[PDB]
Amino acid sequence: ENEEGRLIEKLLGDYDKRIIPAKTLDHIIDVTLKLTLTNLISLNEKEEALTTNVWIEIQWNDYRLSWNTSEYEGIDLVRIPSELLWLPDVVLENNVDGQFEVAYYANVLVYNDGSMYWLPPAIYRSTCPIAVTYFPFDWQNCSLVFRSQTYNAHEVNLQLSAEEGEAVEWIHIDPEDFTENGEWTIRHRPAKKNYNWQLTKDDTDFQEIIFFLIIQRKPLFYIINIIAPCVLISSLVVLVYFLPAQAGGQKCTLSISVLLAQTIFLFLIAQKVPETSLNVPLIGKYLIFVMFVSMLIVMNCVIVLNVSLRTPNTHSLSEKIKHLFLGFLPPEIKSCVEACNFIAKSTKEQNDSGSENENWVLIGKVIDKACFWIALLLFSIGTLAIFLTGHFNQVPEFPFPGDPRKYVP
Amino acid sequence: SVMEDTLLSVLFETYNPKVRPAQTVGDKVTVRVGLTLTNLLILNEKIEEMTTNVFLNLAWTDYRLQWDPAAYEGIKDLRIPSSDVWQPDIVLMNNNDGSFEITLHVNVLVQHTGAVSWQPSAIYRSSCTIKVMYFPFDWQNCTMVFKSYTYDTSEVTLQHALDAKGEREVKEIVINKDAFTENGQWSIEHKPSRKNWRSDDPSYEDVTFYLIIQRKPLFYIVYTIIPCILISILAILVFYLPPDAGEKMSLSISALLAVTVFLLLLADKVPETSLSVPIIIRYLMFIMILVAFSVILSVVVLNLHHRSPNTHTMPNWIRQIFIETLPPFLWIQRPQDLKEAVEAIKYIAEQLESASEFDDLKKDWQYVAMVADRLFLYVFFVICSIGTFSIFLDASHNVPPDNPFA
Amino acid sequence: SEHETRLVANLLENYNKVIRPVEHHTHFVDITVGLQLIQLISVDEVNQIVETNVRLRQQWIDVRLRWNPADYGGIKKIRLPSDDVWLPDLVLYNNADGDFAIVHMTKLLLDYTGKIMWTPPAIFKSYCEIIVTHFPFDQQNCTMKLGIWTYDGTKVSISPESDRPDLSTFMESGEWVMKDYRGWKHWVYYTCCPDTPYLDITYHFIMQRIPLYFVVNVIIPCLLFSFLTGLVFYLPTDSGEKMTLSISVLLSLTVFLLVIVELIPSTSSAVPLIGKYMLFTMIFVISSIIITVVVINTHHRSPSTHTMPQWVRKIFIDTIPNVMFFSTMKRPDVKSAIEGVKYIAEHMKSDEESSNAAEEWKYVAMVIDHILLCVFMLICIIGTVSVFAGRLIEL
Amino acid sequence: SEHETRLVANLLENYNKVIRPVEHHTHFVDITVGLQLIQLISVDEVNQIVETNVRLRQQWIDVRLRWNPADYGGIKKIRLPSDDVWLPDLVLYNNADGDFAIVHMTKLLLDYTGKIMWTPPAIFKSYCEIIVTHFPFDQQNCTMKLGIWTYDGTKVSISPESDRPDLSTFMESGEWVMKDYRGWKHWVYYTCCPDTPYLDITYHFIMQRIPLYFVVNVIIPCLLFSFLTGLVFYLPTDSGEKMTLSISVLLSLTVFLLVIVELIPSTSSAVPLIGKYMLFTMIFVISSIIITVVVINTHHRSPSTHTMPQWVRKIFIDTIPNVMFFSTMKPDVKSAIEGVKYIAEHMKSDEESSNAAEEWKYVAMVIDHILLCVFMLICIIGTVSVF
Amino acid sequence: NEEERLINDLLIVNKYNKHVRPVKHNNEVVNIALSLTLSNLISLKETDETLTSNVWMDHAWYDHRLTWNASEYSDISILRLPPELVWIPDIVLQNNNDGQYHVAYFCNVLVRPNGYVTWLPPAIFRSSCPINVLYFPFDWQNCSLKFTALNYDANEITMDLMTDTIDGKDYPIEWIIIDPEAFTENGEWEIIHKPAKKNIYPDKFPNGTNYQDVTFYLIIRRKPLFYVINFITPCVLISFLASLAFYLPAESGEKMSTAISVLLAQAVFLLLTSQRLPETALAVPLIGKYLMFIMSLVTGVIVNCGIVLNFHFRTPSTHVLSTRVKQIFLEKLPRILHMSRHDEIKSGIDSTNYIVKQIKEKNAYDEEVGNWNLVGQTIDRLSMFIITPVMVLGTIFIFVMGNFNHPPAKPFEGDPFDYSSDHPR
Ligand SMILES: *[C@@H]1O[C@H](CO)[C@@H](O)[C@H](O)[C@H]1NC(C)=O
Ligand SMILES: C[N+](C)(C)CCOC(N)=O
């Protein structure tokens, strides 16, 4: 016969699960927490939520559920459904949804001395305020805040689990069950007991256990798929300085089209970053910079076209301008005779007008070359600087800058 | 009333709703299953599910719920909460979500002879395999498979529901004109019902309700097909523009990008199954490839138009075809001072004559370009018209069968 | 049924569902677990979640629930609510978006020998490591790890029904093809509980994506624009439209890049070949734009200020044109009047000289375009043959 | 604990959680209600719903749950499940996509004098009337109307715990800033129940949007493209690209306007200033396109079919050019004899026609300089005005 | 507190059965008064054809088992009981979209000493509302909430509209109640009519539960300023740009670009309009009709610009200016359309004669080209005069036909009653 049947009937008989198991008035139940991360499912940027697949290990002592193993044929561990027992209402407070408690209410391992061991699984969605300053070269500092929803520090004493005397101050990671995210690398994973000193040992919010996850984004996907195309397309603006400054040269076409492509890329980025307004993402800063540079290049194309396509009819080529831009930066017989004279004169005048047009075209070309050099320098420096400051965003060496401890097993 | 309370106390004194009513071991409970459709809400093509608002007309006999009306002040039938009586676990087996059971647990009607009738309402999301071949000129064949999740043929015998005058079975979905909203995008063509078995499983039996529905494609026509017809018209036009206009590439490329954008935005509404290419996507791809070839041929015509003796020499075959043979068929027929002054006049005249010959050869090249362009115009007009007409004629000849085959 | 009513009353009269169904606490419950796959609802590549419609068949013995048919009119099987009897706590370890355990407490079948068969339904939303490296010609291998949660192998033991999950009633997907599927049993030692093994059954399915939809809707337009890329070299410079063509191709490709990036997950573990090929095509179009800008500059080179280098002339007018066999290239006041005619003649001579030099420059530009057209057509065909290990052209 | 077990058994033995906690039915229960805003989860402008994470603190006295601590080992407080005792039915009147009442039945704290403290959490999805006038620099005022549903003022009375909601533990939004917040108690007479008033507490939060996401993603590109509008006037007609540039600017502006249309609700109560300004910018750009087409047509006017009118020559060639300063504008021998005379005559005619055409070109140039000056003036006065 | 004693007597001592109708004889009928209060018209999703409403359902009936003598107990004149302890009528929304049939919050009922029970729960309802897109965005919709009693047949409980007293005479409440103290006015939808009808279907029987219902209708008119400002004005301006594109000279080299860009903008507007409407085939939306008409017209404009360009770039080397086309496009139409307006000497003589002949031929060629240019100008002027009036008249007609669309000023066309709160019948 299964003696567990009569043992459990004895234990749960005359047992009230609403009563905190305090032996005396001043007894404080010590509740021990330990988080085992099995999968970092995702960090939803749009809603700023970190989803994790964890096993939360909760341990306490319930003196009511203790027995003498000799009276039950050596049974020293039984499994009782958690719905039948008193539990410390340990919940994830910083949850995006309304899910405070665990997902699946597993059984509780009850040992003969009253030790209760509860290890339910959970899919936790917790708020992670996302810093976009260095997107996509960013590292996020996500937190999981655990505290009792019901009992205050005068009743329940939350603590971190300790094995072999040493406290486990980190998110445990079982090698038998763990999967790499593929987009996020877990760099640090400390855990500490925190206090809200604005409160007192009452109010149920005085004490909490915080498990941290300093995760670094892998940017190769973002580089290859967004940044490299964006830089390559933005670099096309500098080509407009080698197109002819006349009808069919298509300087403005190229410039405006590069501007439109950058706008498309801005829309593309808008689908990847959160809609918060605390900072502009690094890639967003680069996009704004290149769009402004392309606007400047459109203006310069318009100006060079205007200069090149000038004529003596509308504009006069000043001698000072010419010097500056070309010296430093770079019966029947009489009627027939009259007809011939006029023909020669008209040809000469047309040729002179053509020569003036040629001078204007040359001035345009010189301006075009100088502005090409300026634009190339500007674009190269901007790109290099922005993505170098992106590449120099290291994850801090220590989980907490003040502490000298590494918080690793 | 007091007497109803007494009757309820007597009926359920020892009644176990967990036990299937079989007055003798081995008896089978006959369950009549009928479906009433109040609204066909959605046929979501992306996830391939049909959402319907239905009543599930169930009927069976429970010998334990019998009483003599004369002994209870003439009470002949009771309304009882569904959870107080045994009911067959009739569920929608092919739901797309996890919802197998009904939503609204109405009271069951129990008559004094033990006959129990139950008409719970539900919002069922049933998986429907979508045939994308003729989208949006398509008819879908969506089914709703109902059977007892728990009891097999050895325990319950599923039957068809009876009509109002319970003399003949109703082998179809019942639609109530008073309570029924037409979809507005789908028209119901057939709605049969049929009991299905499995030759490899003698314990399996279900009642399946089929909805043979036909789509009304006016939305898709107006918002995708006519704009693409206009784009194809522009693509045909590009061959009437003269090469000197400097706008041939603009027009052809604009048409190409427009049709590509139409395909990209239509990719949202079509299903993502790979068993076939919908007729609308096939038409869009045909137009896109036609416009791409229009771009290629416009580039060729522009290249031909801008040649000259200084760069190209016209080969014999080009002159033979495009100058002589095609144009008829295309209807596109086309004192030292005096001596030196004399020398200068000679030079001017020779320059003029050489320029005239050069321009004559250039005009020959431009005429070749014009003739080739006219040929392309005719060919592309024919191909575009024939292809569009053929595709849409094939689409138009796609109607559900008269016999639902079920 | 009176007999069945009495039997059900007697079975559960003094039955405790919190206790394991064993006759001695030393023994273990042997549970035969069989996973039946009904439908593959979805495969969310971006979120890396696979939704499947399954039945979780479980069988075990409960000696407390046995009866003698002769005492109950010959009843040999009954249906009991699953909430009435002890049920194993079988949990899906790799759950990502759904429930860990079974939530649809359907009725179970109980024989008179105590044998129980329980087949509840479930929608499993399990984590799926999506390998976007051959997309859209990829195959996926993601699993469903099932195991008893709170009982070790010495208390409750699970064994698969068969080496493979049951797909007898599987509903064809239309987006994926089932290549292979197995169920492997594991004895896992966790750092929580290092003295006893926990039993586990991991079912895995090899899914081969059917690529027709993605081919037609993504790849064919991209290939079309890529082919049009090299067409800009056949467009003459006098047309004044080369930038139009090249830039339109580039904009189309950036839009399609937007589509690609919103198609696949952002994981960086493996570089998607579709993304790499799109980047290479963008580099291709950018090089086309750069070199056609160079050609346009060459065509419009002013002979007055630029003089053709001897090497340029030799290479692009004396040797390369002879190599292209399939191209059709070419390889008183009366005095005042007298000086007026003089001036006209001299100006025409100078104009002819300048025009001949400009025409030489244009010839060089044309030769460069022909070279680049040949090179870019060769590169495009070589590329389109060899993408996705040729699976695109094979399809 | 044995003492606590016995106490809890004694308290709820004859307790009926359907009756109001009042010694006499003519009294009323005074419930101290406080709202504690934990986090502003979302603000859906299109759907006009505000989703907030709050903790609803409620306090009242239940005389039926008294005890003498000396009789129970000196116990002075216990935690009880909410389901075990009478609870007030506070309802969010303006619920839009959530629950009307509290569904998280957490445990409540019970004092030995009968005082009860209950602080269940909730996710309120309340209706929020969005004012789009100053988007994206707008501030929003929307509220949570909490009141007892079935008990009128004479049976259950609710009072605000504090003049303001508690935001001590509020998580900073990153999209919004709480400028002000307060809670007002009201006595309301409903047409259902006209004899007695129903009490409620309306908590409102004045939240100002942080306008940097939309400045970077919407306003800056729009300003860039609008500023490119004036470049058309400085682009010469000979370039053959005025219409390309102007059309591209107009298409980009309409694309961004259509994007803005997706960020705001479709209500007609107010016209957003951003939308109105974008519409005016498009009107200006289309007027500029009209004038650019007129300028292009003028520049190509053939003197053969058009003679410059006097009112055009007097004004555009003699008046504006002098006024506007910043620019830098302004045998067979007889057959041969007849032929040379004919050539000279053709040069007569060609020179005259070219002179007329150049006059037309000059008129077009002065026109587009006038437009460019107008655009620069508009831009300067606009940029000074905002500063 | 004597409420405890009263409740114990009513529910325990009297053995109240929650699952029995409150009747004394089985053949009696329970009358259920029903009324609806609209506190907020949350949304009307045209794409989903769903109406979301924040309403208060008001049920009222008599339960003879919940009567008491207010004097035997203390003067208790009212009592609040949870709905799960007393019999309540299960009135459900039959035409819901989601699976929500009942009310959101099951609040307490109010019971008076005479047995009059009232129940005023709140609810968020997502009803099915077919959308008439014929006149979008100048449309009015006719949404309904149909409530049925599926737990009992018409022979067991009778639904009714709740009555109200004004001067001692009862009049039914035949409308949705809009409480000024708890109503939020929608910024997009304006409530015109809000009648309530108690429908009976004689083709059915009182045997069953499909014989009766109470339906609350909601004729709401859209406020179109948003769509007029944001969707119609830009579209109209961009469309007029097309007609303007006829005034560009053929030499500009941007006629085709302008017309094409206008067409592409119109296509974008058409696609965005498609995004906002349900995919029903009942009728094409008014704005959809306008966009299709204008896109067709702009395609005609593009084709005619192509014709103009083809005519302009003709030359004697490839085409011949026939007399018919000449007299049509240079004589008649320009006036109709009011458009503006010793051997060295011999060699020298031979060479100058050759030069003169070439110049004469060149001038004749240029004259022919000029004639072709004039023909092109005549053609595009005629095109402008023929097309721009069509554009403006079509725009005005389509957007005046929409503006001349109002709700019918009376629900239920055959019913002369106003169904207004201010004139109860
Ligand atoms: C329905 O009503 C009709 C007409 O009174 C009657 O003949 C029939 O027996 C009734 N059936 C039921 C099931 O009430
Ligand atoms: C007061 N009110 C209208 C908000 C709710 C009415 O609830 C009752 N009194 O039954």
XYZ file of C-alpha atoms in Angstrom, chain E residues 135-360:
226
model
C -20.412 57.396 -49.594
C -17.174 57.172 -47.620
C -16.060 59.496 -45.993
C -19.451 61.267 -46.098
C -21.272 58.175 -44.843
C -23.625 57.338 -42.002
C -23.787 53.841 -40.539
C -26.699 51.907 -39.055
C -25.407 49.687 -36.258
C -27.619 47.506 -34.086
C -27.289 45.548 -30.849
C -29.693 42.599 -30.847
C -30.375 41.030 -27.448
C -31.997 37.611 -27.128
C -33.016 35.428 -24.192
C -31.628 32.011 -25.113
C -32.205 30.382 -21.712
C -36.021 30.433 -21.830
C -38.655 30.492 -24.544
C -41.196 33.232 -25.187
C -43.790 31.198 -23.264
C -41.633 31.378 -20.111
C -40.102 34.874 -20.082
C -41.189 37.904 -22.109
C -38.693 40.595 -23.037
C -39.886 44.191 -23.010
C -38.656 47.739 -23.300
C -38.457 49.392 -19.908
C -41.256 51.852 -19.196
C -41.071 55.260 -17.557
C -43.566 57.579 -15.879
C -43.909 61.283 -16.662
C -47.381 62.224 -15.368
C -48.672 58.942 -13.937
C -48.997 57.309 -17.368
C -46.446 54.704 -18.423
C -44.630 55.080 -21.716
C -42.051 52.605 -23.043
C -38.434 53.674 -23.416
C -38.050 53.188 -27.180
C -34.526 54.592 -27.429
C -31.003 54.162 -26.147
C -30.581 56.279 -23.026
C -27.738 58.797 -23.199
C -27.052 60.018 -19.675
C -25.467 63.501 -19.831
C -23.570 62.773 -16.605
C -21.915 59.614 -17.973
C -21.716 60.034 -21.764
C -18.570 60.826 -23.752
C -19.201 62.283 -27.202
C -17.228 60.554 -29.942
C -14.944 62.815 -31.939
C -15.600 61.014 -35.230
C -19.146 59.616 -34.961
C -22.240 61.680 -34.196
C -25.364 59.877 -32.995
C -28.363 60.924 -35.090
C -30.984 58.332 -34.156
C -30.929 55.699 -31.445
C -34.223 53.778 -31.463
C -35.000 50.572 -29.603
C -37.517 48.019 -30.862
C -38.934 44.795 -29.433
C -39.136 42.525 -32.468
C -41.309 39.424 -32.746
C -40.968 36.893 -35.563
C -44.375 35.278 -36.208
C -42.901 32.691 -38.587
C -41.376 31.102 -35.466
C -43.114 29.768 -32.359
C -43.151 30.653 -28.655
C -41.895 27.075 -28.308
C -38.348 28.301 -28.658
C -35.791 31.018 -28.060
C -35.677 32.634 -31.524
C -39.185 34.111 -31.307
C -38.332 37.463 -29.707
C -35.550 39.946 -29.092
C -34.905 43.563 -28.155
C -32.710 45.426 -30.637
C -31.114 48.815 -30.004
C -30.226 50.648 -33.208
C -27.610 53.358 -33.613
C -27.641 55.554 -36.722
C -24.330 57.416 -36.468
C -23.020 60.005 -38.922
C -19.299 60.376 -39.544
C -17.677 63.771 -39.112
C -15.742 64.087 -42.404
C -13.466 67.066 -41.673
C -10.507 64.803 -40.906
C -10.725 62.932 -44.208
C -11.525 66.078 -46.188
C -8.441 67.849 -44.841
C -6.046 64.907 -44.904
C -7.108 62.692 -47.830
C -9.235 64.650 -50.302
C -7.537 68.055 -50.472
C -4.010 66.776 -51.280
C -5.455 64.318 -53.786
C -7.451 67.043 -55.538
C -4.475 69.404 -55.711
C -2.154 66.716 -57.066
C -4.838 65.760 -59.583
C -5.130 69.333 -60.842
C -1.369 69.276 -61.351
C -2.049 66.766 -64.140
C -4.299 69.135 -66.070
C -1.621 71.766 -65.527
C 0.968 69.444 -67.091
C -0.484 70.342 -70.518
C 0.982 73.859 -70.336
C 4.591 72.642 -70.241
C 6.353 73.136 -73.591
C 7.452 69.991 -75.381
C 11.036 71.276 -75.231
C 10.926 71.354 -71.422
C 11.493 67.606 -71.375
C 9.280 67.126 -68.315
C 5.683 66.752 -69.547
C 5.758 62.980 -69.182
C 7.513 63.147 -65.817
C 4.910 65.542 -64.414
C 1.936 63.518 -65.623
C 3.495 60.234 -64.487
C 4.242 61.619 -61.033
C 0.659 62.813 -60.667
C -0.571 59.350 -61.650
C 1.740 57.648 -59.152
C 0.617 59.968 -56.356
C -3.005 59.182 -57.192
C -2.203 55.461 -57.093
C -0.621 55.861 -53.655
C -3.737 57.671 -52.456
C -5.922 54.895 -53.869
C -3.891 52.243 -52.060
C -4.040 54.136 -48.766
C -7.799 54.521 -49.206
C -7.999 50.770 -49.771
C -6.103 50.248 -46.514
C -8.865 51.959 -44.524
C -11.973 50.119 -45.737
C -13.463 46.625 -45.537
C -12.970 44.371 -48.546
C -16.664 44.103 -49.367
C -18.148 44.091 -52.862
C -21.430 45.825 -52.010
C -20.281 49.064 -53.643
C -17.170 51.043 -54.508
C -16.545 53.895 -52.037
C -17.268 57.409 -53.245
C -13.637 58.417 -52.806
C -12.662 55.176 -54.525
C -14.854 56.093 -57.487
C -13.302 59.555 -57.603
C -9.789 58.125 -57.485
C -10.485 55.592 -60.233
C -12.038 58.289 -62.417
C -9.143 60.687 -61.853
C -6.518 57.981 -62.447
C -8.217 57.086 -65.729
C -8.290 60.761 -66.687
C -4.612 61.223 -65.818
C -3.746 58.124 -67.845
C -5.551 59.777 -70.737
C -3.511 62.906 -70.038
C -0.289 60.875 -70.152
C -1.292 59.238 -73.437
C -2.194 62.598 -74.938
C 1.101 64.113 -73.787
C 2.804 61.216 -75.539
C 0.829 62.017 -78.683
C 1.831 65.682 -78.393
C 5.496 64.751 -78.014
C 5.319 62.389 -80.983
C 3.808 65.143 -83.124
C 6.319 67.743 -81.937
C 9.427 65.687 -82.775
C 8.442 64.850 -86.353
C 10.632 65.955 -89.243
C 10.491 65.897 -93.052
C 13.082 63.110 -92.977
C 10.541 60.686 -91.469
C 7.042 62.210 -91.797
C 5.172 64.375 -94.298
C 2.993 67.254 -93.102
C -0.170 66.523 -95.059
C -2.541 69.295 -96.087
C -5.412 67.912 -94.003
C -3.526 67.930 -90.700
C -2.012 71.290 -91.622
C -5.366 72.962 -92.267
C -6.866 71.298 -89.186
C -4.189 72.155 -86.611
C -2.847 75.422 -88.078
C -5.957 77.072 -89.571
C -9.174 75.930 -87.876
C -8.323 74.885 -84.322
C -5.865 77.703 -83.463
C -8.594 80.203 -84.318
C -11.304 78.150 -82.593
C -9.252 77.839 -79.397
C -8.329 81.554 -79.426
C -4.616 80.772 -79.455
C -2.173 83.656 -79.730
C -1.695 84.671 -83.362
C 40.109 81.611 -114.859
C 38.567 78.412 -113.492
C 39.112 79.695 -109.940
C 36.229 82.138 -110.351
C 34.051 79.318 -111.676
C 34.944 77.086 -108.728
C 34.163 79.891 -106.293
C 30.784 80.539 -107.907
C 29.936 76.833 -107.853
C 30.937 76.515 -104.200
C 28.979 79.570 -103.070
C 25.948 78.310 -104.996
C 26.268 74.956 -103.229
C 26.484 76.734 -99.872
C 23.383 78.790 -100.659
C 21.440 75.711 -101.749
C 22.341 73.857 -98.557
C 21.329 76.829 -96.409
C 18.019 77.065 -98.279
